[PDB]
Amino acid sequence: MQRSIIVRRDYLHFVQKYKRYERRHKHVAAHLSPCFRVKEGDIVTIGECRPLSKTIRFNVIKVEPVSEAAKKRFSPF
Amino acid sequence: PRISRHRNSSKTYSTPKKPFTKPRLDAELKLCGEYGLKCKREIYRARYMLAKIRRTARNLLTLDENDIKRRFEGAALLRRLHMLGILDEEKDQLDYVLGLRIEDIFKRRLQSVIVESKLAKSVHHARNMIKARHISVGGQIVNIPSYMVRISNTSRVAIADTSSLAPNGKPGRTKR
Amino acid sequence: SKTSGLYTARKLRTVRRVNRWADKKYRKAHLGTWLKANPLEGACMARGIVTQKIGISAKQPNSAVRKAVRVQLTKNSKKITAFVPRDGSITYIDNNDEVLVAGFGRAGRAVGDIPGCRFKVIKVAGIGLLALFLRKREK
Amino acid sequence: GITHDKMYKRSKTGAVQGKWHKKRKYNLGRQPANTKLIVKVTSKKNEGQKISTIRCRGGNIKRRALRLSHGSFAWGSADISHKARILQVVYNSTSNELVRTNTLVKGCVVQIDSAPFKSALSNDTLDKEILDQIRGDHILARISSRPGQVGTADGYILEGPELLFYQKKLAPK
Amino acid sequence: ARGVRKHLKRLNAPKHWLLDKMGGIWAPRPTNGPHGLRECIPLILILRNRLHYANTYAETSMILQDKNVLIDGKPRTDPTFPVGFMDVFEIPKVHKTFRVLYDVKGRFTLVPIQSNEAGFKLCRVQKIFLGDKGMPYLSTHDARTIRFPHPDIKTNDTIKINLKTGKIDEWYKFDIGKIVMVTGGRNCGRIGTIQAIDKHMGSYTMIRMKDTEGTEFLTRLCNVFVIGNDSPAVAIPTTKGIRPDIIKNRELRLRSIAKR
RNA sequence: ACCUCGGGAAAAGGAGUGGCUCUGACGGCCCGGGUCAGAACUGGAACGGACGCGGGGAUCCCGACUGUUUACUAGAAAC
RNA sequence: CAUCCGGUCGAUCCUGCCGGAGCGCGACGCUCUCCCCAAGGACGAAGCCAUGCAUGCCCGCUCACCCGGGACGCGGCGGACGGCUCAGGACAACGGUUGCACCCCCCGCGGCGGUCCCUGCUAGCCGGACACCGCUGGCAACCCGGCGCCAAGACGUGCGCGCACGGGCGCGCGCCCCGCGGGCGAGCAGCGUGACGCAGCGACGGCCCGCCCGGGCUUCCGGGGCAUCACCCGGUCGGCGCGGUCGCGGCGCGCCGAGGGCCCGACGCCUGGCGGAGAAUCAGGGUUCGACUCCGGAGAGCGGGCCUGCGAGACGGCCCGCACAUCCAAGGACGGCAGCAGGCGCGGAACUUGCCCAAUGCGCGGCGCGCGAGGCAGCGACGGGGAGCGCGCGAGCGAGGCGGGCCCACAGCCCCCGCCGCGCAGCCGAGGGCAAGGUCUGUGCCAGCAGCCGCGGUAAUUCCAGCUCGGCGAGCGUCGCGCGGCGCUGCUGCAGUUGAAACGCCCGUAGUUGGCCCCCCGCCGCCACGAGGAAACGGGAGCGCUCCAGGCAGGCCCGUUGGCCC
RNA sequence: GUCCCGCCGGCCGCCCAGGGAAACCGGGAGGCUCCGGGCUCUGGGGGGAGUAUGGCCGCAAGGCUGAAACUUGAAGGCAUU
RNA sequence: GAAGGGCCGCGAGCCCCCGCGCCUGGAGGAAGGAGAAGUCGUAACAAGGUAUCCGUAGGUGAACCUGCGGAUGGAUCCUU
């Protein structure tokens, strides 16, 4: 997207009947500042902001780069 | 909406799992003659009360001794049972609470207490006397045979001075 | 089978949801195809005007002519054949009388020797059929 | 019945969203104000600049402008501000179709009479380019006020790289 | 929907108000004023329930219409007037005056005061804001607004209101060591000295305070109201927020019911 | 719908179209193209204003088809 | 708060369903001695409604034939709360958790208070003018015309302190960063200065300013069934520039790109879909329901559209179409019970055209008025709870009946007393499962019964009746369904050689699952303990409603209590 | 000497335990009502019916997916006589 | 400033073709389940008088028969 990223955040949802969990993923749109440059897979610290668009209510506050290929890897940090 | 709608209500009795069982029927009839019980529903209400208590103690006992919970509630359950006379006041242990039987709860029913006090000849006579408002639980007239006396109130129970005996002398049969 | 893993809850939830449908009991209770099929249409009783009367030969081995009234329910105009309980109680029923018909007792299954009949008459012309047999009320 | 709720709009996936409510007077939006200019004073003098007033939620009134004429315009690097009549609207980012009608919108580049700003030209060497515009009776200014939300059209005389950019677009016409 | 709600249902009403479930299908709807519904209690409730001076709401209105009671020294005729912490409920005709504080169980309590104590009431500044030409204003918990505060006073610093001239008297600033009384939540009704304040930048400064029982209660700055420096300052309830536990209160209940 | 998946199909069924006044697109290195969009505004409720220029659908029978045929009474299902 | 038992056979062991055994919560039948509590037109008709009724209060401003009654109007405040129902709506409502540095708000409470001019000010206090009203009228009804006098805390105007000041505008910190404050985690406020503007109150000095209470949106996590729904969307997804709004935002519009969503199930479709708090059943785990009491949502026949106000897209407001009514003198008029009673239709199913604000609240008043909110009675085996139909061998009771208290808006009921006093059982069964004749009649595979096994064709343990007996009990039986039984849905905890069931095989991505190893740190789960925010409910402390279902009580009392957990 | 003895990977027979309703498995069908290594597939009384209809695939034949209404008190396994 | 008009928004209603869900009329076909007693044979279960049965293809009043490749659940755990 144009100066925007769709941050994917992973998380676990627990079901009590079967004490096993379900890995659940959500997609959230975020504004990417030109000051930052992100490649897919990078970890971005989105910070909540004014509803900026139909789907953008979050804005990248910091980026830490990741390698080209290190596997998709479920990460719920 | 109305205030009445807010009011709570409860089924205080437990009906049997099998209602035509031979052992249960035999014991019920033996209990029915013993305590002058009107219907099996009164016996059922007794079983319910014992099951509540047995479960409450059971849960507190599964909790470790000296766990705040047994101290706050276990002491309260024992107190209540000793004060209704269902539990011997010397036992005073939560483990003993589990080993109670419905007969013992039925023993504290005023109709049984009147019979051990002898203020009436039979359990049948005790039910009729309490119905006629003759019995007093201590400064209070009691019409309900079900009344479960507290251990302290047992001494206070006496035939009320206003009644069949020691009174006007003219009610019912005497008047005509 | 029994896939078990700390993060496998979704697979188990899906299996239970899909497999639970297999029992005839879950399907008859929840698929709801039966509700549309049920002449009673999800009611304990239904009011219908007797349109026909007949004798249905009892299923062998038992042999008798069971007495029944064919009734079209007022609610859905849906045909029902209803057994008349008690002895000689079809005499109480008259054609076009109007009856309240309740389930025979097997939740939509024919009961006893009567063949393919799932309903029974409980009331005739505002008067209970048992009461008519017991002579509590008359005509 | 013009409304700004997202009940009548689709989701992120593009799924239709079922409507669970009727229109709300808290979600209503009023019709847009076309703030024309009294440009042709010859036959527009018969209508003096008119600013309407509309009651809003809360009872607070937003003055909305229908026809406007002049607003405060300021040369910031000179600190010269005067009330200037707006001669003409040129170059709007939203649409150049608006420019033809002269309807004023915040951010439209306008032309204002330099006769109020005449004293600054005599004051020595104020800037450079803006002085030439004062010498010729037309100065470019951006309307910095939202006509129809306050009913005013104040602004700033364009200067710096912004002035050059706007002039470059308007060079052929 | 539409506008405001002018009715309160009895079971919706706050638990601390201790209204009867079968007593009514409606509860007094508390009005706006110096205290909000969660942190107030209606004037009718103090007079009808605890004071029992008026048998019915109608009697409470008659008494109020005649200006029998004065809160903060002003005769108020509002049956639903909100009453909260440090409000001075003085009924002169009955000859008895008390403050409204917080009990350990969290219900509001009437604590008797001497004439000097009756004169002043404590306040907590929520924050200092600039308005009306830039003059600073301080907003107390009782919503009392004071223009031009002395510069040292900061947010969450208890101050004392004269209530006769209605001005600031003194400031006991919020700091480590100063004695405070919790106003809300699980520890509501407890007086303890401040062991530490955790900054928790971002949201919810959480403070830890400990009473003389060696038990530390952890409560955020919202419901912490300073009551004097190391000194408890204004008179405090007889329990003194010492945190009686459930087992101990069980013995106290039994002694009270021992009396017949 | 149907289909030999190529077709059916321009299916059916609609909406626009003029004049004027503009505004964007598109090359080469201030010089060329006149096509494609988007507006206003105007006209007895008008615009492919002459001219040019399929009516459409549902079936049934024969012959798959494009072809060819009794110059001069059969152009077909015939060859 | 852990259970089974009949039926496949000549017999037997299995698997397997079938049927019983328990509890609900609605109907239906039969029956009912009293007292207490208590549901009641939700159940594919959010169908239609006759009548009466549910919203007033005020006394600001009295020249209405009592008086200083306080008609009527005008003003003011409320009518947006409340009640009612569940049609709509499935990344929604809703629940917990954030945010508004993106906001709107009446009352109240506590503050604050200044308002340019030129003219035009009368400031010891200013104009006019409208009903009500008087007359003159037109109306089938609805409904209003005209004329003339007269008032406001109504209206119109304006006295006014050029640090007079509503809005909006232009400008006014940095030097890699972060370390005082008016105020923050955050450059946010405020103001200084110029240009505009001259808005509000100023005719019984309020504008403004907080806090509150409510609202609007906003973060996060949860929020149906179907794969005979696999691709879906095209303001769809972003960026920019505006408009609009209370504001933020594709919200709308231009402009520019090509996104956005999806086996971790998109999109479609269907739902006899309000959601939670909760409820039914219940060893543990679970399953099903959540119309209905509290909270939030949504709608008043259906679509829309508005006005008023601080807040309504309001329907006991308006306007329009659309069906569906009423009146009519035929021109017109006019509604809206998913408010309360009551009526019709419909369905298996559901209460009085009562009485009243006394409480409990609310609106308005300072010396109480309004309220079908609510309370009070009637109806009512939805149900829950308590006592009866004797005991004794002679004494009694209460069911009644009548007075008087007590109670009640007024009754009544309860309860207390005197005086009389008259106890009164059903409904399903007896071959089993399943407790209770292998009785005595009729009848003859008929008539019937029987959930299931079966029974009846002359010696019916089974039908139809007397007879006894048994269960349960003022209740009992039947039907539909939920749950339990059913380890027959299985996470605990099923089965797949042959009972039903290992893909014919190999590769294979998503998915799921991964040996051993570093102690001592950072994130993730993870466990413990907090905090924060609703009670009711469910537990659970205490309290003898005479017991009990109950309720928060009570008694010279922890500041009597009403703890605490969830 | 293609001897003896192992080891590893197979292909087998017989079985002690154990298991199962048994027939029988026993290199598992054991280590499992004292039930949990991981992962996929399928089953949930007998018919109706692998039918109807919808999808896809095939030149067809057909394959793959796949019901319901309704009916019924049995169907089945393994052993004994 | 009243009606009235123009123009756009917001937007009922109405018609018009078009999809969708659902309900059902129907000559004629064509299944299935029961009626009870029919009719024609006798395919299978005993090597059921041609061992059955699986796929697939052809035939046939009807069960069924036949080709080809399987299986044993067979009537064979048994032969340089």
PDB file of C-alpha atoms in Angstrom, chain C:
ATOM      1  CA  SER C   1      -6.636 -41.002  16.461  1.00  0.00           C
ATOM      2  CA  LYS C   2      -7.153 -38.288  19.099  1.00  0.00           C
ATOM      3  CA  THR C   3      -4.785 -35.681  17.722  1.00  0.00           C
ATOM      4  CA  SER C   4      -3.576 -33.965  20.895  1.00  0.00           C
ATOM      5  CA  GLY C   5      -1.208 -30.980  20.963  1.00  0.00           C
ATOM      6  CA  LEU C   6      -1.148 -27.852  23.122  1.00  0.00           C
ATOM      7  CA  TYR C   7      -2.230 -25.749  20.079  1.00  0.00           C
ATOM      8  CA  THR C   8      -4.607 -28.221  18.284  1.00  0.00           C
ATOM      9  CA  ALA C   9      -7.965 -27.058  19.709  1.00  0.00           C
ATOM     10  CA  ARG C  10      -9.378 -25.941  16.321  1.00  0.00           C
ATOM     11  CA  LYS C  11      -8.966 -29.387  14.713  1.00  0.00           C
ATOM     12  CA  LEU C  12     -10.812 -31.035  17.644  1.00  0.00           C
ATOM     13  CA  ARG C  13     -13.631 -28.409  17.593  1.00  0.00           C
ATOM     14  CA  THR C  14     -14.131 -28.989  13.840  1.00  0.00           C
ATOM     15  CA  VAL C  15     -14.152 -32.791  14.233  1.00  0.00           C
ATOM     16  CA  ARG C  16     -16.777 -32.628  16.990  1.00  0.00           C
ATOM     17  CA  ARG C  17     -18.912 -30.171  14.984  1.00  0.00           C
ATOM     18  CA  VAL C  18     -18.826 -32.295  11.785  1.00  0.00           C
ATOM     19  CA  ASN C  19     -19.016 -35.738  13.514  1.00  0.00           C
ATOM     20  CA  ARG C  20     -21.827 -34.758  15.932  1.00  0.00           C
ATOM     21  CA  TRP C  21     -24.185 -34.522  12.900  1.00  0.00           C
ATOM     22  CA  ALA C  22     -23.774 -38.277  12.171  1.00  0.00           C
ATOM     23  CA  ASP C  23     -26.114 -39.465  14.972  1.00  0.00           C
ATOM     24  CA  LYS C  24     -29.762 -39.715  13.880  1.00  0.00           C
ATOM     25  CA  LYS C  25     -30.589 -38.164  17.276  1.00  0.00           C
ATOM     26  CA  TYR C  26     -28.542 -34.984  16.773  1.00  0.00           C
ATOM     27  CA  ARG C  27     -29.878 -34.628  13.212  1.00  0.00           C
ATOM     28  CA  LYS C  28     -33.548 -35.175  14.104  1.00  0.00           C
ATOM     29  CA  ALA C  29     -33.178 -32.729  17.022  1.00  0.00           C
ATOM     30  CA  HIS C  30     -31.058 -30.017  15.319  1.00  0.00           C
ATOM     31  CA  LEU C  31     -31.097 -30.399  11.498  1.00  0.00           C
ATOM     32  CA  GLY C  32     -34.715 -29.236  11.736  1.00  0.00           C
ATOM     33  CA  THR C  33     -35.666 -30.902   8.475  1.00  0.00           C
ATOM     34  CA  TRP C  34     -38.039 -32.807  10.806  1.00  0.00           C
ATOM     35  CA  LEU C  35     -39.692 -29.568  12.020  1.00  0.00           C
ATOM     36  CA  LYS C  36     -40.921 -28.867   8.466  1.00  0.00           C
ATOM     37  CA  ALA C  37     -41.927 -32.548   8.058  1.00  0.00           C
ATOM     38  CA  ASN C  38     -43.682 -32.692  11.487  1.00  0.00           C
ATOM     39  CA  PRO C  39     -47.463 -32.356  10.926  1.00  0.00           C
ATOM     40  CA  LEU C  40     -47.643 -31.094  14.560  1.00  0.00           C
ATOM     41  CA  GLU C  41     -45.118 -28.395  13.477  1.00  0.00           C
ATOM     42  CA  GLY C  42     -43.372 -28.151  16.878  1.00  0.00           C
ATOM     43  CA  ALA C  43     -46.472 -28.342  19.096  1.00  0.00           C
ATOM     44  CA  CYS C  44     -47.509 -30.885  21.775  1.00  0.00           C
ATOM     45  CA  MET C  45     -51.112 -30.768  20.494  1.00  0.00           C
ATOM     46  CA  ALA C  46     -52.916 -29.518  17.362  1.00  0.00           C
ATOM     47  CA  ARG C  47     -56.601 -28.738  16.648  1.00  0.00           C
ATOM     48  CA  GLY C  48     -58.023 -30.338  13.478  1.00  0.00           C
ATOM     49  CA  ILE C  49     -61.512 -31.039  12.080  1.00  0.00           C
ATOM     50  CA  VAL C  50     -62.188 -34.744  11.419  1.00  0.00           C
ATOM     51  CA  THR C  51     -62.358 -35.189   7.622  1.00  0.00           C
ATOM     52  CA  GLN C  52     -62.467 -39.032   7.494  1.00  0.00           C
ATOM     53  CA  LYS C  53     -62.833 -42.105   9.782  1.00  0.00           C
ATOM     54  CA  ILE C  54     -61.379 -45.617   9.128  1.00  0.00           C
ATOM     55  CA  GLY C  55     -60.307 -48.969  10.646  1.00  0.00           C
ATOM     56  CA  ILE C  56     -56.576 -49.825  10.316  1.00  0.00           C
ATOM     57  CA  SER C  57     -55.693 -53.550  10.467  1.00  0.00           C
ATOM     58  CA  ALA C  58     -53.257 -54.114  13.371  1.00  0.00           C
ATOM     59  CA  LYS C  59     -49.710 -55.174  12.335  1.00  0.00           C
ATOM     60  CA  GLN C  60     -49.220 -58.969  12.520  1.00  0.00           C
ATOM     61  CA  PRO C  61     -48.748 -60.835  14.852  1.00  0.00           C
ATOM     62  CA  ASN C  62     -51.386 -58.848  16.823  1.00  0.00           C
ATOM     63  CA  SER C  63     -54.722 -58.762  14.950  1.00  0.00           C
ATOM     64  CA  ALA C  64     -57.625 -56.263  15.412  1.00  0.00           C
ATOM     65  CA  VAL C  65     -59.164 -53.307  13.531  1.00  0.00           C
ATOM     66  CA  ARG C  66     -57.746 -50.227  15.338  1.00  0.00           C
ATOM     67  CA  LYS C  67     -60.231 -47.331  15.141  1.00  0.00           C
ATOM     68  CA  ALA C  68     -58.869 -44.031  13.800  1.00  0.00           C
ATOM     69  CA  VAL C  69     -60.076 -40.691  12.387  1.00  0.00           C
ATOM     70  CA  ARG C  70     -58.176 -39.083   9.477  1.00  0.00           C
ATOM     71  CA  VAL C  71     -57.964 -35.375  10.435  1.00  0.00           C
ATOM     72  CA  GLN C  72     -56.577 -32.367   8.532  1.00  0.00           C
ATOM     73  CA  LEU C  73     -54.911 -30.024  11.035  1.00  0.00           C
ATOM     74  CA  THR C  74     -56.456 -26.517  11.104  1.00  0.00           C
ATOM     75  CA  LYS C  75     -52.959 -24.995  11.627  1.00  0.00           C
ATOM     76  CA  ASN C  76     -51.226 -26.172   8.424  1.00  0.00           C
ATOM     77  CA  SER C  77     -53.981 -28.059   6.526  1.00  0.00           C
ATOM     78  CA  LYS C  78     -51.669 -31.091   6.939  1.00  0.00           C
ATOM     79  CA  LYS C  79     -53.162 -34.617   6.977  1.00  0.00           C
ATOM     80  CA  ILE C  80     -52.794 -36.687  10.176  1.00  0.00           C
ATOM     81  CA  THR C  81     -54.261 -40.148  10.953  1.00  0.00           C
ATOM     82  CA  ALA C  82     -55.011 -40.349  14.688  1.00  0.00           C
ATOM     83  CA  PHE C  83     -55.711 -43.444  16.839  1.00  0.00           C
ATOM     84  CA  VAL C  84     -58.712 -43.250  19.196  1.00  0.00           C
ATOM     85  CA  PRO C  85     -57.594 -44.543  22.643  1.00  0.00           C
ATOM     86  CA  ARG C  86     -59.788 -46.583  25.111  1.00  0.00           C
ATOM     87  CA  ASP C  87     -62.445 -49.228  24.320  1.00  0.00           C
ATOM     88  CA  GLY C  88     -65.101 -48.429  21.686  1.00  0.00           C
ATOM     89  CA  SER C  89     -64.296 -44.730  21.914  1.00  0.00           C
ATOM     90  CA  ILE C  90     -64.622 -44.102  18.122  1.00  0.00           C
ATOM     91  CA  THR C  91     -68.368 -43.973  18.935  1.00  0.00           C
ATOM     92  CA  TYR C  92     -67.625 -40.690  20.779  1.00  0.00           C
ATOM     93  CA  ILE C  93     -65.896 -39.282  17.633  1.00  0.00           C
ATOM     94  CA  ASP C  94     -68.204 -38.033  14.829  1.00  0.00           C
ATOM     95  CA  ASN C  95     -67.103 -36.823  11.352  1.00  0.00           C
ATOM     96  CA  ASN C  96     -66.440 -33.002  11.273  1.00  0.00           C
ATOM     97  CA  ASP C  97     -66.567 -32.893  15.129  1.00  0.00           C
ATOM     98  CA  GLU C  98     -63.158 -31.068  15.596  1.00  0.00           C
ATOM     99  CA  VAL C  99     -60.554 -32.808  17.806  1.00  0.00           C
ATOM    100  CA  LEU C 100     -57.325 -31.942  19.634  1.00  0.00           C
ATOM    101  CA  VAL C 101     -54.696 -34.523  18.625  1.00  0.00           C
ATOM    102  CA  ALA C 102     -51.511 -35.146  20.649  1.00  0.00           C
ATOM    103  CA  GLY C 103     -48.429 -37.244  19.943  1.00  0.00           C
ATOM    104  CA  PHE C 104     -48.864 -41.023  20.212  1.00  0.00           C
ATOM    105  CA  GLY C 105     -45.717 -41.041  22.418  1.00  0.00           C
ATOM    106  CA  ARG C 106     -42.595 -42.117  20.439  1.00  0.00           C
ATOM    107  CA  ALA C 107     -41.663 -38.590  19.179  1.00  0.00           C
ATOM    108  CA  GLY C 108     -42.836 -39.101  15.567  1.00  0.00           C
ATOM    109  CA  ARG C 109     -42.630 -42.898  15.437  1.00  0.00           C
ATOM    110  CA  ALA C 110     -45.656 -45.232  15.009  1.00  0.00           C
ATOM    111  CA  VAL C 111     -46.442 -46.889  18.369  1.00  0.00           C
ATOM    112  CA  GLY C 112     -47.362 -50.577  18.784  1.00  0.00           C
ATOM    113  CA  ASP C 113     -49.389 -52.711  16.349  1.00  0.00           C
ATOM    114  CA  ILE C 114     -50.954 -49.609  14.747  1.00  0.00           C
ATOM    115  CA  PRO C 115     -49.037 -49.214  11.437  1.00  0.00           C
ATOM    116  CA  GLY C 116     -47.532 -45.855  10.376  1.00  0.00           C
ATOM    117  CA  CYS C 117     -49.775 -43.862  12.790  1.00  0.00           C
ATOM    118  CA  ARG C 118     -47.970 -41.237  14.941  1.00  0.00           C
ATOM    119  CA  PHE C 119     -50.904 -39.337  16.569  1.00  0.00           C
ATOM    120  CA  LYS C 120     -53.749 -39.974  19.080  1.00  0.00           C
ATOM    121  CA  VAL C 121     -57.033 -38.155  19.904  1.00  0.00           C
ATOM    122  CA  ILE C 122     -57.054 -36.518  23.365  1.00  0.00           C
ATOM    123  CA  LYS C 123     -60.162 -34.273  23.049  1.00  0.00           C
ATOM    124  CA  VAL C 124     -63.457 -34.421  21.064  1.00  0.00           C
ATOM    125  CA  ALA C 125     -65.679 -31.305  20.682  1.00  0.00           C
ATOM    126  CA  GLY C 126     -64.123 -29.524  23.729  1.00  0.00           C
ATOM    127  CA  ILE C 127     -64.465 -32.663  25.968  1.00  0.00           C
ATOM    128  CA  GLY C 128     -61.533 -34.953  26.949  1.00  0.00           C
ATOM    129  CA  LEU C 129     -61.787 -38.383  25.231  1.00  0.00           C
ATOM    130  CA  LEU C 130     -60.617 -40.218  28.403  1.00  0.00           C
ATOM    131  CA  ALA C 131     -63.310 -38.343  30.362  1.00  0.00           C
ATOM    132  CA  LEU C 132     -65.876 -39.467  27.762  1.00  0.00           C
ATOM    133  CA  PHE C 133     -64.714 -43.103  28.279  1.00  0.00           C
ATOM    134  CA  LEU C 134     -64.736 -42.667  32.094  1.00  0.00           C
ATOM    135  CA  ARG C 135     -68.286 -41.161  31.905  1.00  0.00           C
ATOM    136  CA  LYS C 136     -67.099 -38.007  33.743  1.00  0.00           C
ATOM    137  CA  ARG C 137     -68.922 -35.923  31.060  1.00  0.00           C
ATOM    138  CA  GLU C 138     -71.556 -36.769  28.378  1.00  0.00           C
ATOM    139  CA  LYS C 139     -71.695 -35.863  24.610  1.00  0.00           C
TER     140      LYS C 139
END
